Paper text:
Voltage-gated sodium channels are transmembrane proteins responsible for the generation of action potentials in excitable cells and play important roles in the propagation of electrical impulses throughout nerves. They are complexes of a pore-forming α subunit and auxiliary β subunits, designated β1/β1B–β4 (encoded by SCN1B–4B). In addition to the channel modulation, the β subunits function as cell adhesion molecules. In this study, we determined the crystal structures of the mouse and human β4ex proteins containing all three Cys residues, which revealed the formation of a dimer in a parallel arrangement, mediated by the intermolecular disulfide bond and the exchange of the N-terminal segments.
In this study, the human β4ex containing all of the Cys residues was prepared, and its crystal structure was determined in the hexagonal form at 2.2-Å resolution. The human β4ex also assumes the same parallel arrangement as those in the previous and present mouse β4ex crystals. Therefore, it appears that the parallel arrangement of β4 is a conserved natural property. The anti-parallel arrangement was not observed in the cubic and hexagonal crystal forms, probably because PEG fragments were bound to the trans homophilic interface (hexagonal form) and because detergent was used for the crystallization and the C-terminal tag sequence was present (cubic form) (see “Experimental Procedures”). The parallel arrangement of the β4 molecules was mediated, in common, through two types of interactions. This type of interaction is designated hereafter as the N–N interaction. Moreover, in this N–N interaction, the N-terminal segments form hydrogen bonds between their Glu32 and Ser34 with Ser56 and Thr54, respectively, and join the β sheets of the counterparts. As these intermolecular interactions are sophisticated and conserved in the human and mouse β4 structures, we hereafter designate the two β4ex molecules in the parallel arrangement as the parallel dimer.
Numbering used by the authors:
A (entry chain B): 30 to 104, 112 to 135, 142 to 152
B (entry chain A): 30 to 104, 112 to 136, 141 to 152
Write the structure that this text describes.
């Protein structure tokens, strides 16, 4: 039918020592098969693949195929949660989705 | 045709004296005709209708039918921009959308 969004980019502030949800959801008018997704971290001096996986189809959950660290977990929802935040976690978190698309979260740990 | 989103709620910080975009977009699978939208402000002690309008259908631009103040403008996309921000502009900005069942997106704005 119809759904609303605050867009594809957001700044999030979060306190050191806690946990934060980094949101990304996607919608499919059509029927998708074998979706590919990847979360990356970027700072001026650093790059990391945080987590990646696939989504077989609209009915099935996302399967995680690779994960950098167990401080990260996955929660159509491909949001991630970053546990036990540190000040070095500040930077840019991007969710890339194939089958071409990306959402961007700027995380500031305070 | 696929589309991603960071969701339906966000916190926004903005500097007094400047302008801020309060985002809300919507997507149509089936389609729509004569959609109704309304933006409200809420604080613990206050309520306002900021702007109201309709979108004739998926091809047409949004049509504004009522606006509280010219500090607000509309910028499919039914985002609004709030100009000449004041500290009292802090609060909850909600975008309500109706398709005849209702949907809404919520911005928490803190002016700093």
């Amino acid at each position: 039918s119809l759904e609303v969004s605050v867009g594809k980019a957001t700044d999030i502030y979060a306190v050191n020592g806690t946990e934060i949800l980094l949101p990304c959801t996607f919608s499919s008018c059509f029927g998708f098969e074998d979706l590919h997704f990847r979360w990356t971290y970027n700072s001026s001096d650093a790059f990391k693949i945080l987590i990646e996986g696939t989504v077989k189809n609209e009915k099935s959950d996302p399967k995680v195929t690779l994960k950098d660290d167990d401080r990260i977990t996955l929660v159509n929802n491909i949001s991630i949660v970053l546990r036990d935040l540190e000040f070095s976690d500040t930077g840019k978190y991007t969710c890339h989705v194939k089958n071409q698309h990306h959402a961007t979260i700027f995380l500031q740990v305070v």
